[PDB]
Design a protein around this ligand. Structure first.
Ligand code: NAG
Ligand code: NAG
Ligand code: NAG
Ligand code: NAG
Lengths: 497, 497, 497, 497
């Protein structure tokens, strides 16, 4: 285990500086002895997932805030946590020297880092690309004779993905999403702008597009990568907007329904890759519950949909009950999954603010809200970006948890990285969210889950300046007496056994 | 043989549209009897290298500007003209269907095109690459047992160079230039930023860097490609600026001097590639004559140096006479060559302006000035780019004479292409610049050369809006009465006996 | 009446050009007998509030969509429509020659224009100012003896307001809103950023801030201007955001509640301006119903609150029903008013797009939705801006219905101007929204209101490209057969007896 | 004194943090006792104009670097040092609270700060404005009846200038420069773009423009401000450029000559402001000596020109002797003055790099070069900018020595501020540059001057990483034994008395 090397860039908190020979890391995980609890703490003042242990006590008196575990109120099971291997992310990582590359990948994927188990993979180019390309740019190639993976896949994304999986203990799940089809499949004949697939679901354009998903999976399988899921389209609402500046493909919910029922569903089902799941929407949660109803109340589309993917832009405000809550109500057996999140918009400030505690707080707050409304996973955007928040061919720069400084052969772990890690490190696939009731109103954000083995995990975030004394009660074991300092985040772990 | 198909994109002139089945081209060269001239004319208004013929007459009917050929005043011999096969150019060309690829290469390299006879080849990655790599990225490999060419060379660059040479009637000269060394030879262990070679001339690193040149030449020789020349480093002055964003290797003039004297010269001489020439500088002309004095005043460096390579980018900072003229005067036996003949984009303009007559004029004006100041040859930068000026892993700043639309299997030949061809097509290797005396002050840019066979060539560029009546006198033949239209460029050719 | 003189700037529609001697305008309003209707029509194709008349007859010949007036279903009464006299608007208007100023003011405020009857007036500086100032910048002046109006008020805003009121036949209501207090009343001692009032409700700082409102009203009353209403703070939620770039003053909903209960309410009540109304929130609708619940469920605050002001900017984040509808349901006797009825340029678009039909449609669509969810009035943002969307001391981000070119003594009336006028001109204060039942699902946006005198008004917006045949039934008069052209807005008016 | 409060933003050095109650400052200046020298030192490691004193010794032996004062080799006399009161500068300063504004203005203008005695004042708007305006925007107002100063002058620039002069003990010289004329005086009718004055020198457009200079001066005199000098036009070469993005007015050198001879010269001479001097050029030194020859070899223009104003963009490197030295040689009696300098540019790093030691070094290196080539004064660009390098209406952001953070009511003094102050504080108006010979080639930049009272000043900049032991010999007094630490700058002062 090595501790953070802090560096300030003049914002509210510090980054942790890594290079070819040094990066902060954890010792291997160990469970806390029965009758005791583990606490990991990060603070704006500079603590970074610092470990301590305390006793679980038999008794508690006093009128302080009490959060009581409700182990018999069981909600969703967790799919996992990760981020996106974009062209930008892969280019920045591979521009580091090999030992630094490995310390970066370890940070995210190893048990000695934060245990990511999801990687989102763009199907060809997006805004976080240095050029526009699809896998089938030969005009009118309906048989997809000229489908192929460029160097961006074979030389950047794919070798990094293999390395990530080799470092991970846990099985990693790959999720793919397209931004645009070939331009010759599109009404507007351009990668961006307003335009959808030509023709009507059922037809040659829609069939070719569905077979393009299959060719993609085939090509990745040639390189020994298999996918857990695909989305129907990244942000289908974007292709409905005039002058949309980067790669998109428009679908109304009805077009999405009919494409899935007529084309994508049957095509994937008839392929060797029929086990790959399909997620719909892959867009802002403001489009729910409407989009889910349109798609999922058609049994011919419904039978092909495993889940509903949501995005959020963190610089904007919620509210989750009406969108996430209502969708779960209507379709409780169709998982909700957060497939993309990012910060920076935003407007008076930079795309990358090195050391922003506030941006970290946005991540963990969003993650708790999502977990409180049935969401089974949360996936960050770009795994790594440069200090400008790119590259991005359209200059649509945003922040990332890891910022690579190629000229210095170094990378900075932002507070966002640790805010993410407080969840990803401590909530394996299979974990189930359970009840946690506050004895009184409070300023804390908290969530409780139980590991597949039975043990408990609680994350508590304090976005206020005031320290908050608190007790967590688990009837199986007793009381954890603790304090949540202002501008901190804690994860608590204990056996119930 | 086939005329330009014009298209406007809102700029001052048109591009010529080419695709898989059509591109503008020339008939094989054919020139008239003594007393007749051939004129090729391009105009902002849309003419593109249009041919006409007329008389050279015994009597003088013009009363305006006279330009008199003076074949007895003889200056430099021409090496030739070309452009760079960057990874970006190769990626763009290879994104066309094979028939379109061939029309693109014929446009540049055939006699039915503009007859390039020089190709500059980066040694591994530069900014116009989609990733960072070198030929020996495995560290501590001081004998370079692990030196190898990646796909960029073996799949993209080499095959296209082979195809270029097959199309050219004239022999093509290859010129190589490295941007960065393996980062384990560098002070800063990065591809970019402030950093030079580790240690000092003569040491293990400097000898390893020199051996890399030979390794490069060996590798290319295995692919049946031989080099005319190499430069000592691309823009060595860039690797001295902190945070320099592109691949670089810094050298002060004294470090270049000693590396040449102690390592590169001896190593090259000791190889089977001892015939390959060595050019120094390869940087902005503002660094002259200083850089030339530092290096060429040292006999142990100068015996290994064939010429001085210059870049045009910052030409606006330093006038030709004080730089090019003065260097020639001090070292009249060391040739000057423009190795990156790509001039500076205005800060508020896009990288690519399809159909910009201004950018074309800037090329021809700068070729004329260079010819008037002793320069023997030109390599343009990227032979082709996409409509964004890419791909470039850092940022697009520059235009290119051919722009490829990889969604429409089409490419566009810019005014730059035709301004370049007004020289490259009509000035073969071994042509000699001769005197051309203006009878009075004027605003045209003009230059005269004599082909090896004794025939004359004169280029006349009118950067003004106003038509200029013109007479050209050959004392051996008579008077050519003509008009240089506003915003035009003409190339006149004639037999002298 | 003088017709629109159209000009295109490359966007989907035209602007109307006005200058010192010419501007489009309407005849005095004149309406026909029972059995006849009047129709004003604007189209993307270029029609601008063009008038025609036709029959309402006994026989129903349409077989398509039917919209039936239901005058017995009665909803909210309208306060009115207007825009904001920012420093920027006043600077822009005052840069015209006096005859041009007058045509611009008549365009907005006369019956020969679009009949605005509301002006919102910033209390001191906001982003649309050329400098930061407040009315009491001299520190520790707790009795506000140094409170004064600068030239922005006395030379720019106030004479323009006087001229507006003199031009209007309808009584004009003034609404004031502050952005920041004097920085010495603030926790952070700055005009912007994260900061609130010092101390706690009831103290000297809070009392001084309340007194500032009264001092403002006194000052304006000295210039013979009286206010209809004030808002408690412009965008209180902005001043809780670290680094917020514009003038701001943060209030959580409880702090607003308590400031109103403890200070603002009692101070206004104790003054000679006790009749001026107080509106809460003045912020995004995503903050409702919560904000309304916090403030309005406290009788000590709620007794002082006349209505709830909303901004449209972030409307896309939260549907009308859940915010406006639910707030109405919970607090049906507290009026909803849109105090900054403005959006909100897509992140990749210019602040000003001269002739954008889309931006016009957004205004009319959002007026219609507001009217359908109980909203009683609208103030647009800046009355006029320059072509850069300025002046703004931070950053230009929004368009305006009138754009002034200060170099040509001209102003341009945008499609937004006409989409506003289709409501403002034909819905006087006291008009009541009534039912209008669609016979079948359709894509038009429509709303019916009844004038105080009992005559009918119906606005129909067609946001689609397709013509929609339409009948409108008035049970008292008969059937109006019409067509709503694609990309059109119509206002229909008729007598009902 | 109060010492610097250092803050790092991650760059090579620290900024000094000032706010309403604290700013670093000097004690009143005092003369070093005879037989002693004063030294002020700034270093990248963090020293900021730190004062020490040592002995002047009677001899010296050991052959390290010796700099010998040559007090009888006398060159130019110094006019002064200062910077630009742009709209951007003034809006930033006035957005700080009043006590912080005074500390900022003391930093620059007081003897307890760095002693600026020049302020450059734009005549109306430039790129560092938040809107475009001129003083006479009424079309075809040839009598300039509607000439007036807007708030940018009467409320921001003019009050700050008054306060600057009150703080200064040295007399301050004001310098005015226009960027554009009224658009109706211009061939292109727009504030930016390619365009010059309509008509021909002598005519009404040229006479009105000359009279505009006099009306500007009259209006400033109404406010009790007088000018030392005006320039003929900011950057005349910029208006010759198609698409130039911001305010400009093109003049060829011939046009400038003829405008001065026919219009500006006689008009100023005939006014009450005839004592105001006129500087020509006000543009990049690359335009010299050609522009000087064109203007100054015409006695009808020459009689009106007091000096030549030059600009530099410090991220570029022209040579100086060819430009400055040659112009001095041709026109030794026409002073050379540097009227604007700025850094960044450097696309790949930001406009503002808080704490950049490299950018400070660019300033001091430029000032020494200028002083070594006859230049009598050096004037920075914007006195203060925000952290983005604005406001700038065209987003042409750049760095500034003082960076205002309005949200924190604080300002940061950059290394540039100190590098400038090593000259401005210690080289009063009247100081004459004298000889200083190095005993051996070295990497130091050094310059020697004598104060009006006879005392000596020497600045030494070390841009290398290596400490350099150094002796300075003054025959009147002896030897100063010192060291120039790597990445330092020192000013040495001593009486010779
Ligand atoms: C990498 O970081 C470690 C720990 O801070 C440091 O001691 C070491 O020198 C660094 N290596 C570099 C900068 O090459
Ligand atoms: C290629 O260009 C030629 C000449 O314009 C044209 O006739 C042909 O249709 C083009 N090919 C395609 C597929 O557009
Ligand atoms: C004002 O506009 C009217 C209507 O287009 C036009 O006839 C008149 O010439 C305009 N005035 C000027 C000075 O352009
Ligand atoms: C101003 O600066 C000094 C830092 O040296 C500090 O002691 C003081 O608290 C600061 N004041 C404010 C208001 O931040």
């Amino acid at each position: 285990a090595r501790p953070c090397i802090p560096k300030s860039f003049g914002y509210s908190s510090v980054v942790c500086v890594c290079n070819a020979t040094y990066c902060d890391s954890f010792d291997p995980p160990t469970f806390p002895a029965l009758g005791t609890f583990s606490r990991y703490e990060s603070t704006r003042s500079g603590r970074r997932m610092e470990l301590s242990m305390g006793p679980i006590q038999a008794n508690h008196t006093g009128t302080g805030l009490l959060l009581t575990l409700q182990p018999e109120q069981k909600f969703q099971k967790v799919k996992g946590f990760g981020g996106a291997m974009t062209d930008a992310a892969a280019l920045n990582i591979l521009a580091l020297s090999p030992p630094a590359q490995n310390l970066l990948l370890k940070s995210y994927f190893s048990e000695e880092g934060i245990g990511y188990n999801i990687i989102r993979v763009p199907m060809a180019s997006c805004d976080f690309s240095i050029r526009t390309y699809t896998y089938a740019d030969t005009p009118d190639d309906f048989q997809l004779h000229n489908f192929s993976l460029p160097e961006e896949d074979t030389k950047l994304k794919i070798p990094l993905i293999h390395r990530a999986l080799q470092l991970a203990q846990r099985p990693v799940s790959l999720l793919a999403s397209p931004w645009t089809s070939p331009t010759w499949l599109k009404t507007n004949g351009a990668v961006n702008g307003k335009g959808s697939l030509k023709g009507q679901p059922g037809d040659i354009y829609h069939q070719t597009w569905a077979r393009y998903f299959v060719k993609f999976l085939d090509a990745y399988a040639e390189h020994k990568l298999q996918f857990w899921a695909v989305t129907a389209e990244n942000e289908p609402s974007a292709g409905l907007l005039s002058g949309y500046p980067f790669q998109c493909l428009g679908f109304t919910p009805e077009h999405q329904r009919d494409f899935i029922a007529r084309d994508l569903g049957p095509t994937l089902a008839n392929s060797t890759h029929h086990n790959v799941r399909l997620l719909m929407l892959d867009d802002q949660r403001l489009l729910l519950p409407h989009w889910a109803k349109v798609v999922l109340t058609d049994p011919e589309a419904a039978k092909y949909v495993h889940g509903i993917a949501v995005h959020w832009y963190l610089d904007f405000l919620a509210p989750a009950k009406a969108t996430l809550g209502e969708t779960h109500r209507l379709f409780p057996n169709t998982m909700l999954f957060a497939s993309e999140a990012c910060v920076g918009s935003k407007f008076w400030e930079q795309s990358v603010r090195l050391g922003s505690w506030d941006r970290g707080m946005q991540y963990s707050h969003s993650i708790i809200t999502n977990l409180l409304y049935h969401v089974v996973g949360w996936t960050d955007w770009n795994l790594a970006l440069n200090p400008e928040g790119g590259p991005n061919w359209v200059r649509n720069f945003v922040d990332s948890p890891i910022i690579v400084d190629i000229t210095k052969d170094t990378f900075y772990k932002q507070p966002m990285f640790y805010h993410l890690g407080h969840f990803s490190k401590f909530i394996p696939e299979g974990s189930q969210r359970v009840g946690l009731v506050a004895s009184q109103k409070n300023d804390l954000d908290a969530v409780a889950l139980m590991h597949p083995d039975g043990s408990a995990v609680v994350v508590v975030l304090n976005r206020s300046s005031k320290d908050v004394p608190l007790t967590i009660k688990d009837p199986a074991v007793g009381f954890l007496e603790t304090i949540s300092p202002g501008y901190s985040i804690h994860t608590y772990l204990w056996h119930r056994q």
